UniProtKB/TrEMBL annotation, chains A, B:
Keywords: Isomerase, Lyase, Metal-binding
Species the sequence originates in: Corynebacterium glutamicum (strain ATCC 13032 / DSM 20300 / JCM 1318 / BCRC 11384 / CCUG 27702 / LMG 3730 / NBRC 12168 / NCIMB 10025 / NRRL B-2784 / 534)
Signal peptide per UniProt: none
Gene3D superfamilies recorded: FAH, Fumarylacetoacetase-like, C-terminal domain
Annotated protein name in UniProt: 2-keto-4-pentenoate hydratase/2-oxohepta-3-ene-1,7-dioic acid hydratase (Catechol pathway)
Amino acid sequence: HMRFGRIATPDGMCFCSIEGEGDDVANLTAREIEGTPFTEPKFTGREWPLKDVRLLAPMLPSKVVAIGRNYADHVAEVFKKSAESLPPTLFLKPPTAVTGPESPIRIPSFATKVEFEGELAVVIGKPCKNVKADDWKSVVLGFTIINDVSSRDLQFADGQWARAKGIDTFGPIGPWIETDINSIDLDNLPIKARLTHDGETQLKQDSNSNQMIMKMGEIIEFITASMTLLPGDVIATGSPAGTEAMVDGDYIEIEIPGIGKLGNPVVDA
Amino acid sequence: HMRFGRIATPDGMCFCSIEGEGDDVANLTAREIEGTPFTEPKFTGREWPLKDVRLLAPMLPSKVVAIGRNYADHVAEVFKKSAESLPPTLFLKPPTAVTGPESPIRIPSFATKVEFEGELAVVIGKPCKNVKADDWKSVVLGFTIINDVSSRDLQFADGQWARAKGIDTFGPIGPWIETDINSIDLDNLPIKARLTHDGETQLKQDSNSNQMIMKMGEIIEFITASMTLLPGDVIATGSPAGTEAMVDGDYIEIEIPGIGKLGNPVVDA
Ligand SMILES: O=C([O-])C(=O)[O-]
Ligand SMILES: O=C([O-])C(=O)[O-]
Ligand SMILES: [Mg+2]
Ligand SMILES: [Mg+2]
Ligand SMILES: [Mg+2]
Protein backbone atom coordinates (compact mmCIF):
# COMPACT_ATOMS: atom_id res chain seq x y z
CA HIS A 1 0.00 0.00 0.00
CA MET A 2 3.01 2.18 -0.11
CA ARG A 3 4.13 4.88 -2.53
CA PHE A 4 7.26 3.73 -4.41
CA GLY A 5 9.89 6.03 -5.89
CA ARG A 6 13.41 6.15 -7.19
CA ILE A 7 16.03 8.47 -5.84
CA ALA A 8 19.56 9.53 -6.39
CA THR A 9 21.88 10.16 -3.55
CA PRO A 10 25.21 11.81 -2.94
CA ASP A 11 25.88 8.13 -3.04
CA GLY A 12 23.85 6.15 -5.62
CA MET A 13 20.34 5.25 -6.80
CA CYS A 14 17.62 3.23 -5.34
CA PHE A 15 14.04 2.31 -5.10
CA CYS A 16 12.31 3.58 -2.01
CA SER A 17 9.03 4.01 -0.34
CA ILE A 18 7.88 7.57 0.24
CA GLU A 19 6.40 8.36 3.59
CA GLY A 20 5.01 11.49 5.04
CA GLU A 21 1.93 13.56 4.87
CA GLY A 22 0.10 14.45 1.77
CA ASP A 23 2.70 15.61 -0.69
CA ASP A 24 5.22 18.27 0.18
CA VAL A 25 8.82 17.05 0.02
CA ALA A 26 9.93 19.17 2.85
CA ASN A 27 7.48 16.95 4.77
CA LEU A 28 8.61 13.75 3.13
CA THR A 29 10.87 10.86 3.92
CA ALA A 30 12.35 8.31 1.54
CA ARG A 31 12.99 4.83 2.98
CA GLU A 32 15.33 2.68 1.01
CA ILE A 33 14.06 -0.69 -0.13
CA GLU A 34 16.36 -3.63 -0.84
CA GLY A 35 15.29 -4.82 -4.26
CA THR A 36 12.48 -3.65 -6.63
CA PRO A 37 8.87 -2.81 -6.09
CA PHE A 38 7.86 -6.10 -7.61
CA THR A 39 8.07 -8.17 -4.37
CA GLU A 40 7.07 -7.47 -0.70
CA PRO A 41 9.36 -4.71 0.47
CA LYS A 42 12.71 -5.39 2.04
CA PHE A 43 13.56 -2.14 3.83
CA THR A 44 17.20 -1.48 4.61
CA GLY A 45 16.65 0.81 7.57
CA ARG A 46 18.19 3.67 5.70
CA GLU A 47 16.18 6.86 5.16
CA TRP A 48 16.74 10.38 3.97
CA PRO A 49 14.26 13.18 4.09
CA LEU A 50 13.12 13.86 0.57
CA LYS A 51 14.42 17.35 0.40
CA ASP A 52 17.86 16.00 0.95
CA VAL A 53 17.89 13.91 -2.21
CA ARG A 54 16.57 13.97 -5.73
CA LEU A 55 13.43 12.22 -6.87
CA LEU A 56 13.76 10.42 -10.18
CA ALA A 57 11.30 8.77 -12.55
CA PRO A 58 9.92 5.94 -10.43
CA MET A 59 10.58 3.31 -13.01
CA LEU A 60 12.63 2.59 -16.08
CA PRO A 61 9.94 1.04 -18.25
CA SER A 62 10.82 -1.40 -21.00
CA LYS A 63 8.17 0.49 -22.95
CA VAL A 64 5.58 3.19 -22.76
CA VAL A 65 2.27 2.24 -24.37
CA ALA A 66 -0.12 5.07 -24.86
CA ILE A 67 -3.73 5.54 -25.73
CA GLY A 68 -4.27 8.52 -28.01
CA ARG A 69 -7.59 10.31 -28.44
CA ASN A 70 -9.17 8.95 -25.27
CA TYR A 71 -10.89 12.14 -24.24
CA ALA A 72 -13.58 13.48 -26.64
CA ASP A 73 -13.00 17.18 -26.00
CA HIS A 74 -9.28 16.77 -26.38
CA VAL A 75 -9.85 15.29 -29.80
CA ALA A 76 -11.95 18.32 -30.58
CA GLU A 77 -9.40 20.87 -29.48
CA VAL A 78 -6.39 19.18 -31.15
CA PHE A 79 -7.78 17.85 -34.42
CA LYS A 80 -10.73 20.18 -34.79
CA LYS A 81 -12.99 17.20 -35.38
CA SER A 82 -15.55 15.45 -33.31
CA ALA A 83 -14.35 12.34 -31.61
CA GLU A 84 -16.65 9.98 -33.47
CA SER A 85 -14.45 10.15 -36.59
CA LEU A 86 -11.17 9.73 -34.67
CA PRO A 87 -11.31 6.83 -32.24
CA PRO A 88 -8.74 6.05 -29.55
CA THR A 89 -5.59 4.54 -30.91
CA LEU A 90 -2.46 2.90 -29.53
CA PHE A 91 0.99 4.39 -29.81
CA LEU A 92 4.41 4.10 -28.19
CA LYS A 93 6.83 6.45 -26.48
CA PRO A 94 10.47 5.34 -26.26
CA PRO A 95 12.08 4.80 -22.87
CA THR A 96 14.50 7.57 -23.74
CA ALA A 97 11.61 10.07 -23.61
CA VAL A 98 11.16 9.34 -19.93
CA THR A 99 12.30 11.86 -17.37
CA GLY A 100 11.53 12.53 -13.70
CA PRO A 101 10.08 15.24 -11.44
CA GLU A 102 11.66 18.70 -11.76
CA SER A 103 13.67 17.61 -14.76
CA PRO A 104 13.65 19.90 -17.71
CA ILE A 105 11.57 19.39 -20.72
CA ARG A 106 14.23 20.14 -23.41
CA ILE A 107 12.64 21.37 -26.65
CA PRO A 108 14.72 21.20 -29.81
CA SER A 109 14.44 24.02 -32.26
CA PHE A 110 12.74 21.92 -34.91
CA ALA A 111 9.97 20.93 -32.46
CA THR A 112 7.21 23.56 -32.53
CA LYS A 113 3.79 23.97 -30.95
CA VAL A 114 4.82 21.71 -28.06
CA GLU A 115 2.02 21.05 -25.67
CA PHE A 116 1.78 19.36 -22.30
CA GLU A 117 -0.64 16.50 -21.76
CA GLY A 118 -1.36 15.44 -18.22
CA GLU A 119 -2.44 11.87 -18.03
CA LEU A 120 -3.22 9.10 -15.61
CA ALA A 121 -0.63 6.34 -15.96
CA VAL A 122 -0.72 2.72 -14.83
CA VAL A 123 2.40 0.77 -13.94
CA ILE A 124 2.32 -2.91 -14.75
CA GLY A 125 3.27 -5.31 -11.93
CA LYS A 126 3.47 -8.67 -13.63
CA PRO A 127 3.96 -10.25 -17.06
CA CYS A 128 0.64 -10.31 -18.82
CA LYS A 129 -0.97 -11.19 -22.11
CA ASN A 130 -4.59 -11.54 -23.24
CA VAL A 131 -5.96 -9.95 -20.08
CA LYS A 132 -9.72 -9.76 -19.74
CA ALA A 133 -11.16 -6.36 -19.11
CA ASP A 134 -12.82 -7.20 -15.79
CA ASP A 135 -9.58 -8.72 -14.48
CA TRP A 136 -7.56 -5.58 -15.08
CA LYS A 137 -6.50 -4.81 -11.53
CA SER A 138 -4.72 -8.11 -11.29
CA VAL A 139 -1.87 -6.79 -13.47
CA VAL A 140 -1.39 -3.34 -11.99
CA LEU A 141 1.29 -2.45 -9.53
CA GLY A 142 0.18 1.13 -9.13
CA PHE A 143 -0.78 4.53 -10.57
CA THR A 144 1.37 7.46 -11.41
CA ILE A 145 1.25 10.57 -13.61
CA ILE A 146 2.65 11.12 -17.03
CA ASN A 147 3.04 14.27 -19.12
CA ASP A 148 2.66 13.09 -22.72
CA VAL A 149 4.64 16.05 -24.20
CA SER A 150 3.77 16.48 -27.91
CA SER A 151 4.91 18.67 -30.80
CA ARG A 152 1.69 19.42 -32.60
CA ASP A 153 3.52 20.66 -35.67
CA LEU A 154 5.58 17.44 -35.89
CA GLN A 155 2.48 15.31 -35.30
CA PHE A 156 0.81 16.81 -38.27
CA ALA A 157 3.79 16.89 -40.57
CA ASP A 158 5.05 13.39 -39.75
CA GLY A 159 1.78 11.49 -39.76
CA GLN A 160 3.15 8.94 -37.35
CA TRP A 161 3.27 10.66 -33.99
CA ALA A 162 6.33 8.75 -32.81
CA ARG A 163 8.91 11.47 -33.29
CA ALA A 164 6.56 14.17 -32.08
CA LYS A 165 5.96 12.41 -28.81
CA GLY A 166 9.30 10.61 -28.50
CA ILE A 167 11.98 13.29 -28.32
CA ASP A 168 14.27 13.03 -25.24
CA THR A 169 12.55 14.35 -22.11
CA PHE A 170 9.05 14.37 -23.75
CA GLY A 171 7.77 11.92 -21.10
CA PRO A 172 8.00 13.12 -17.52
CA ILE A 173 6.69 10.44 -15.11
CA GLY A 174 6.11 10.64 -11.42
CA PRO A 175 6.27 11.67 -8.85
CA TRP A 176 5.92 8.17 -7.38
CA ILE A 177 3.84 5.12 -7.77
CA GLU A 178 0.71 4.94 -5.67
CA THR A 179 0.08 1.28 -4.98
CA ASP A 180 -3.08 1.75 -2.92
CA ILE A 181 -5.18 1.19 -6.01
CA ASN A 182 -8.42 1.08 -4.27
CA SER A 183 -7.94 4.55 -2.91
CA ILE A 184 -8.33 5.73 -6.52
CA ASP A 185 -11.72 5.73 -8.11
CA LEU A 186 -11.59 5.75 -11.86
CA ASP A 187 -15.21 6.80 -12.06
CA ASN A 188 -14.27 9.87 -10.06
CA LEU A 189 -10.72 11.05 -10.36
CA PRO A 190 -9.75 14.57 -11.23
CA ILE A 191 -6.95 15.33 -13.59
CA LYS A 192 -5.54 18.88 -13.55
CA ALA A 193 -2.71 20.87 -15.07
CA ARG A 194 -1.31 24.24 -14.17
CA LEU A 195 0.97 26.19 -16.49
CA THR A 196 3.20 28.91 -15.22
CA HIS A 197 3.98 31.38 -17.95
CA ASP A 198 5.68 34.69 -17.58
CA GLY A 199 5.56 34.39 -13.82
CA GLU A 200 1.91 33.68 -13.69
CA THR A 201 0.14 30.41 -13.01
CA GLN A 202 -3.11 29.29 -14.63
CA LEU A 203 -5.30 26.25 -14.54
CA LYS A 204 -5.32 24.61 -17.97
CA GLN A 205 -6.73 21.08 -17.73
CA ASP A 206 -9.40 20.47 -15.15
CA SER A 207 -11.19 17.26 -15.96
CA ASN A 208 -11.77 13.73 -14.63
CA SER A 209 -10.86 10.18 -15.65
CA ASN A 210 -14.56 9.51 -15.82
CA GLN A 211 -14.43 11.19 -19.23
CA MET A 212 -12.29 8.40 -20.74
CA ILE A 213 -13.72 6.93 -23.90
CA MET A 214 -11.87 3.68 -23.44
CA LYS A 215 -12.08 2.66 -19.83
CA MET A 216 -9.22 1.09 -17.82
CA GLY A 217 -10.23 -2.52 -18.28
CA GLU A 218 -10.86 -2.03 -21.92
CA ILE A 219 -7.43 -0.40 -22.37
CA ILE A 220 -5.56 -3.27 -20.73
CA GLU A 221 -7.51 -5.88 -22.70
CA PHE A 222 -6.96 -3.95 -25.96
CA ILE A 223 -3.21 -3.59 -25.41
CA THR A 224 -2.51 -7.14 -24.14
CA ALA A 225 -4.44 -8.71 -26.98
CA SER A 226 -1.56 -7.46 -29.14
CA MET A 227 1.45 -7.13 -26.90
CA THR A 228 2.87 -8.67 -23.81
CA LEU A 229 3.33 -6.23 -20.99
CA LEU A 230 6.14 -6.54 -18.44
CA PRO A 231 6.69 -5.42 -14.89
CA GLY A 232 7.55 -1.81 -15.00
CA ASP A 233 5.81 -0.99 -18.29
CA VAL A 234 3.77 2.21 -18.32
CA ILE A 235 0.38 2.79 -19.87
CA ALA A 236 -0.63 6.38 -20.57
CA THR A 237 -4.43 6.46 -20.51
CA GLY A 238 -4.96 9.70 -22.41
CA SER A 239 -5.16 13.42 -21.98
CA PRO A 240 -8.21 15.58 -21.13
CA ALA A 241 -8.87 18.86 -22.94
CA GLY A 242 -7.18 22.10 -22.08
CA THR A 243 -3.69 21.58 -23.40
CA GLU A 244 -1.60 24.31 -24.89
CA ALA A 245 1.79 25.25 -26.12
CA MET A 246 4.82 25.80 -23.94
CA VAL A 247 7.97 27.80 -24.29
CA ASP A 248 11.40 28.21 -22.68
CA GLY A 249 10.94 29.45 -19.13
CA ASP A 250 7.54 27.96 -18.52
CA TYR A 251 6.71 25.46 -15.77
CA ILE A 252 4.07 22.81 -16.09
CA GLU A 253 2.48 20.96 -13.23
CA ILE A 254 0.14 18.05 -13.54
CA GLU A 255 -2.02 17.16 -10.52
CA ILE A 256 -3.94 14.03 -9.77
CA PRO A 257 -5.41 14.02 -6.27
CA GLY A 258 -4.69 10.76 -4.57
CA ILE A 259 -1.34 10.49 -6.37
CA GLY A 260 0.30 13.86 -6.21
CA LYS A 261 1.94 16.40 -8.46
CA LEU A 262 4.27 16.16 -11.43
CA GLY A 263 6.20 19.31 -12.20
CA ASN A 264 8.80 20.26 -14.76
CA PRO A 265 10.55 23.35 -16.05
CA VAL A 266 10.68 23.90 -19.78
CA VAL A 267 13.77 24.96 -21.68
CA ASP A 268 15.18 25.17 -25.18
CA ALA A 269 17.67 22.39 -25.81
CA HIS B 1 35.04 -8.29 -37.43
CA MET B 2 33.21 -11.06 -35.78
CA ARG B 3 29.64 -12.15 -36.28
CA PHE B 4 27.84 -11.98 -32.96
CA GLY B 5 24.91 -14.12 -31.99
CA ARG B 6 22.75 -15.10 -29.07
CA ILE B 7 21.97 -18.68 -28.27
CA ALA B 8 19.92 -20.82 -25.91
CA THR B 9 22.00 -23.87 -25.05
CA PRO B 10 21.48 -27.20 -23.38
CA ASP B 11 23.10 -25.13 -20.72
CA GLY B 12 21.58 -21.62 -20.68
CA MET B 13 21.63 -18.47 -22.89
CA CYS B 14 24.76 -16.67 -23.94
CA PHE B 15 26.39 -14.32 -26.39
CA CYS B 16 28.56 -15.99 -28.92
CA SER B 17 30.74 -15.64 -32.06
CA ILE B 18 29.49 -17.49 -35.01
CA GLU B 19 32.13 -19.31 -36.97
CA GLY B 20 32.25 -21.12 -40.24
CA GLU B 21 31.42 -21.19 -43.91
CA GLY B 22 28.01 -20.44 -45.23
CA ASP B 23 25.00 -18.77 -43.89
CA ASP B 24 23.87 -22.42 -43.41
CA VAL B 25 23.70 -23.80 -39.81
CA ALA B 26 25.06 -27.31 -40.02
CA ASN B 27 28.25 -25.89 -41.26
CA LEU B 28 28.52 -23.44 -38.37
CA THR B 29 29.84 -23.24 -34.89
CA ALA B 30 28.84 -21.07 -31.94
CA ARG B 31 31.70 -20.00 -29.69
CA GLU B 32 30.75 -18.76 -26.26
CA ILE B 33 32.11 -15.41 -25.11
CA GLU B 34 32.12 -14.33 -21.51
CA GLY B 35 30.66 -10.91 -21.95
CA THR B 36 28.67 -9.05 -24.60
CA PRO B 37 29.36 -7.83 -28.15
CA PHE B 38 30.23 -4.38 -26.88
CA THR B 39 33.60 -5.17 -25.34
CA GLU B 40 36.63 -7.12 -26.30
CA PRO B 41 35.59 -10.74 -26.77
CA LYS B 42 36.89 -13.33 -24.28
CA PHE B 43 36.11 -16.91 -25.25
CA THR B 44 35.10 -19.27 -22.51
CA GLY B 45 36.19 -22.31 -24.51
CA ARG B 46 32.67 -23.71 -24.79
CA GLU B 47 31.54 -24.30 -28.32
CA TRP B 48 28.55 -25.96 -30.03
CA PRO B 49 27.49 -26.95 -33.46
CA LEU B 50 24.95 -24.34 -34.34
CA LYS B 51 22.48 -27.06 -35.20
CA ASP B 52 22.46 -28.23 -31.61
CA VAL B 53 21.48 -24.95 -30.04
CA ARG B 54 18.81 -22.36 -30.61
CA LEU B 55 19.71 -19.17 -32.31
CA LEU B 56 17.98 -16.20 -30.72
CA ALA B 57 17.49 -12.58 -31.76
CA PRO B 58 21.17 -11.36 -31.42
CA MET B 59 20.15 -8.53 -29.24
CA LEU B 60 17.52 -7.49 -26.76
CA PRO B 61 17.14 -3.86 -27.81
CA SER B 62 15.90 -1.09 -25.51
CA LYS B 63 13.95 0.12 -28.56
CA VAL B 64 13.52 -0.53 -32.22
CA VAL B 65 13.36 2.62 -34.31
CA ALA B 66 12.06 2.28 -37.81
CA ILE B 67 12.04 4.36 -40.93
CA GLY B 68 8.80 3.84 -42.87
CA ARG B 69 8.24 4.71 -46.53
CA ASN B 70 11.92 4.64 -47.41
CA TYR B 71 11.57 2.77 -50.71
CA ALA B 72 9.55 4.56 -53.39
CA ASP B 73 8.04 1.53 -55.03
CA HIS B 74 7.12 0.11 -51.64
CA VAL B 75 5.15 3.24 -50.94
CA ALA B 76 3.42 2.79 -54.30
CA GLU B 77 2.39 -0.82 -53.73
CA VAL B 78 1.27 -0.33 -50.18
CA PHE B 79 -0.41 3.09 -50.10
CA LYS B 80 -1.32 3.33 -53.78
CA LYS B 81 0.32 6.69 -54.06
CA SER B 82 3.62 8.01 -55.29
CA ALA B 83 6.28 8.59 -52.67
CA GLU B 84 6.41 12.33 -53.18
CA SER B 85 3.32 12.78 -51.26
CA LEU B 86 4.16 10.30 -48.47
CA PRO B 87 7.77 10.89 -47.29
CA PRO B 88 9.89 8.70 -44.96
CA THR B 89 8.66 8.77 -41.44
CA LEU B 90 9.91 7.53 -38.08
CA PHE B 91 8.08 4.92 -36.01
CA LEU B 92 8.74 2.52 -33.15
CA LYS B 93 8.38 -1.21 -32.62
CA PRO B 94 8.22 -2.55 -29.03
CA PRO B 95 10.99 -4.87 -27.78
CA THR B 96 8.24 -7.45 -27.19
CA ALA B 97 7.73 -7.72 -30.94
CA VAL B 98 11.28 -8.99 -31.34
CA THR B 99 11.82 -12.68 -32.05
CA GLY B 100 14.66 -14.83 -33.42
CA PRO B 101 15.47 -17.02 -36.42
CA GLU B 102 13.05 -19.91 -36.93
CA SER B 103 10.69 -18.71 -34.25
CA PRO B 104 7.06 -18.44 -35.34
CA ILE B 105 5.35 -15.34 -36.46
CA ARG B 106 2.08 -15.74 -34.53
CA ILE B 107 -0.81 -13.98 -36.19
CA PRO B 108 -3.80 -13.05 -33.94
CA SER B 109 -7.21 -13.52 -35.57
CA PHE B 110 -7.90 -9.81 -35.45
CA ALA B 111 -4.80 -9.04 -37.53
CA THR B 112 -5.32 -9.40 -41.25
CA LYS B 113 -3.49 -8.76 -44.49
CA VAL B 114 -0.27 -9.36 -42.53
CA GLU B 115 2.75 -8.73 -44.74
CA PHE B 116 6.44 -9.42 -44.42
CA GLU B 117 8.95 -6.61 -44.87
CA GLY B 118 12.59 -7.52 -45.30
CA GLU B 119 14.84 -4.70 -44.15
CA LEU B 120 18.47 -3.87 -43.52
CA ALA B 121 18.98 -3.25 -39.84
CA VAL B 122 21.64 -1.45 -37.87
CA VAL B 123 22.63 -2.24 -34.29
CA ILE B 124 23.85 0.70 -32.28
CA GLY B 125 27.28 0.28 -30.64
CA LYS B 126 27.60 3.31 -28.48
CA PRO B 127 25.40 5.85 -26.70
CA CYS B 128 24.78 8.76 -28.99
CA LYS B 129 22.87 11.94 -29.68
CA ASN B 130 22.94 14.55 -32.41
CA VAL B 131 25.05 12.41 -34.66
CA LYS B 132 26.15 14.02 -37.93
CA ALA B 133 25.40 12.11 -41.16
CA ASP B 134 28.92 11.48 -42.27
CA ASP B 135 29.84 10.26 -38.82
CA TRP B 136 27.38 7.42 -38.83
CA LYS B 137 29.73 4.47 -38.91
CA SER B 138 31.20 5.64 -35.61
CA VAL B 139 28.05 4.68 -33.66
CA VAL B 140 27.29 1.35 -35.30
CA LEU B 141 28.11 -2.05 -33.86
CA GLY B 142 27.07 -3.92 -37.00
CA PHE B 143 24.37 -4.93 -39.34
CA THR B 144 21.66 -7.50 -39.09
CA ILE B 145 18.35 -8.30 -40.80
CA ILE B 146 14.88 -7.39 -39.67
CA ASN B 147 11.40 -8.55 -40.82
CA ASP B 148 9.14 -5.58 -40.18
CA VAL B 149 5.91 -7.61 -40.02
CA SER B 150 2.82 -5.50 -40.57
CA SER B 151 -0.95 -5.91 -40.59
CA ARG B 152 -1.98 -3.75 -43.47
CA ASP B 153 -5.62 -3.78 -42.33
CA LEU B 154 -4.69 -2.56 -38.86
CA GLN B 155 -2.32 0.07 -40.25
CA PHE B 156 -5.19 1.63 -42.14
CA ALA B 157 -7.89 1.24 -39.52
CA ASP B 158 -5.77 2.42 -36.60
CA GLY B 159 -3.91 5.39 -38.25
CA GLN B 160 -0.98 5.07 -35.95
CA TRP B 161 0.96 2.01 -37.09
CA ALA B 162 2.11 0.98 -33.64
CA ARG B 163 -0.31 -1.87 -33.04
CA ALA B 164 -0.14 -3.08 -36.64
CA LYS B 165 3.62 -3.37 -36.46
CA GLY B 166 3.98 -4.10 -32.75
CA ILE B 167 2.12 -7.33 -32.09
CA ASP B 168 4.23 -9.93 -30.28
CA THR B 169 6.59 -11.70 -32.74
CA PHE B 170 6.07 -9.06 -35.48
CA GLY B 171 9.77 -8.22 -35.38
CA PRO B 172 12.08 -11.12 -36.19
CA ILE B 173 15.75 -10.05 -36.12
CA GLY B 174 18.97 -11.89 -37.03
CA PRO B 175 20.41 -14.24 -37.69
CA TRP B 176 23.46 -12.51 -36.18
CA ILE B 177 25.21 -9.15 -36.07
CA GLU B 178 27.80 -8.60 -38.78
CA THR B 179 30.48 -6.29 -37.38
CA ASP B 180 32.52 -6.07 -40.54
CA ILE B 181 30.82 -2.91 -41.62
CA ASN B 182 33.11 -2.03 -44.45
CA SER B 183 32.54 -5.38 -46.10
CA ILE B 184 29.02 -4.17 -46.87
CA ASP B 185 28.44 -1.67 -49.63
CA LEU B 186 25.38 0.41 -49.02
CA ASP B 187 25.58 1.75 -52.62
CA ASN B 188 25.18 -1.88 -53.66
CA LEU B 189 23.59 -4.33 -51.25
CA PRO B 190 20.89 -6.66 -52.52
CA ILE B 191 17.87 -7.24 -50.30
CA LYS B 192 15.68 -10.25 -51.07
CA ALA B 193 12.75 -12.15 -49.62
CA ARG B 194 11.41 -15.56 -50.52
CA LEU B 195 7.97 -16.65 -49.44
CA THR B 196 7.06 -20.29 -49.23
CA HIS B 197 3.32 -20.83 -49.66
CA ASP B 198 1.61 -24.20 -50.15
CA GLY B 199 4.91 -25.88 -50.66
CA GLU B 200 6.23 -23.52 -53.31
CA THR B 201 8.91 -20.94 -52.85
CA GLN B 202 8.94 -17.67 -54.74
CA LEU B 203 11.17 -14.61 -54.82
CA LYS B 204 9.06 -11.68 -53.71
CA GLN B 205 11.35 -8.85 -52.80
CA ASP B 206 14.45 -8.40 -54.98
CA SER B 207 15.91 -4.95 -54.63
CA ASN B 208 18.92 -3.08 -53.21
CA SER B 209 19.75 -0.66 -50.47
CA ASN B 210 20.80 1.79 -53.16
CA GLN B 211 17.07 2.47 -53.59
CA MET B 212 16.77 3.93 -50.10
CA ILE B 213 15.20 7.36 -50.13
CA MET B 214 16.89 8.48 -46.89
CA LYS B 215 20.47 7.19 -46.85
CA MET B 216 22.11 5.55 -43.86
CA GLY B 217 23.87 8.68 -42.56
CA GLU B 218 20.76 10.75 -42.94
CA ILE B 219 18.73 8.18 -41.05
CA ILE B 220 21.09 8.23 -38.04
CA GLU B 221 21.26 12.00 -38.06
CA PHE B 222 17.44 12.28 -38.36
CA ILE B 223 16.81 9.88 -35.49
CA THR B 224 19.51 11.13 -33.10
CA ALA B 225 18.49 14.73 -33.57
CA SER B 226 15.37 13.67 -31.63
CA MET B 227 16.32 10.53 -29.61
CA THR B 228 19.26 9.24 -27.77
CA LEU B 229 20.28 5.84 -29.09
CA LEU B 230 21.85 3.22 -26.83
CA PRO B 231 24.08 0.19 -27.44
CA GLY B 232 21.85 -2.57 -28.56
CA ASP B 233 19.15 -0.38 -30.08
CA VAL B 234 18.00 -1.46 -33.53
CA ILE B 235 17.29 0.72 -36.50
CA ALA B 236 15.16 -0.65 -39.29
CA THR B 237 16.02 1.09 -42.54
CA GLY B 238 12.88 0.37 -44.60
CA SER B 239 11.45 -2.24 -46.84
CA PRO B 240 11.81 -2.60 -50.61
CA ALA B 241 8.88 -3.30 -52.88
CA GLY B 242 7.42 -6.76 -53.32
CA THR B 243 5.75 -7.49 -50.05
CA GLU B 244 2.60 -9.55 -49.70
CA ALA B 245 0.38 -11.22 -47.19
CA MET B 246 1.22 -14.32 -45.31
CA VAL B 247 -0.96 -16.96 -43.76
CA ASP B 248 -0.74 -19.90 -41.40
CA GLY B 249 1.74 -22.45 -42.72
CA ASP B 250 3.85 -20.06 -44.78
CA TYR B 251 7.62 -19.65 -44.27
CA ILE B 252 9.27 -16.35 -45.04
CA GLU B 253 12.96 -15.95 -45.63
CA ILE B 254 14.82 -12.66 -45.85
CA GLU B 255 18.32 -12.67 -47.46
CA ILE B 256 20.92 -9.93 -47.37
CA PRO B 257 24.12 -11.25 -48.96
CA GLY B 258 27.07 -10.36 -46.74
CA ILE B 259 24.85 -10.79 -43.71
CA GLY B 260 22.91 -14.00 -44.16
CA LYS B 261 19.33 -15.27 -44.00
CA LEU B 262 16.46 -14.70 -41.58
CA GLY B 263 13.74 -17.29 -41.81
CA ASN B 264 10.54 -17.71 -39.84
CA PRO B 265 7.39 -19.98 -40.00
CA VAL B 266 3.98 -18.33 -39.91
CA VAL B 267 1.19 -19.58 -37.69
CA ASP B 268 -2.26 -18.60 -36.57
CA ALA B 269 -2.26 -17.58 -32.93
O1 LIG C 1 -3.42 11.60 -28.56
C1 LIG C 1 -2.99 11.66 -27.40
O2 LIG C 1 -1.83 11.51 -27.04
C2 LIG C 1 -3.99 11.87 -26.41
O3 LIG C 1 -5.09 11.96 -26.85
O4 LIG C 1 -3.68 11.88 -25.22
O1 LIG D 1 6.51 1.49 -43.84
C1 LIG D 1 7.45 0.78 -43.53
O2 LIG D 1 7.59 0.22 -42.45
C2 LIG D 1 8.42 0.62 -44.56
O3 LIG D 1 8.26 1.31 -45.50
O4 LIG D 1 9.31 -0.19 -44.45
MG1 LIG E 1 7.71 35.20 -24.19
MG1 LIG F 1 -1.50 11.59 -24.87
MG1 LIG G 1 9.06 -1.33 -42.42
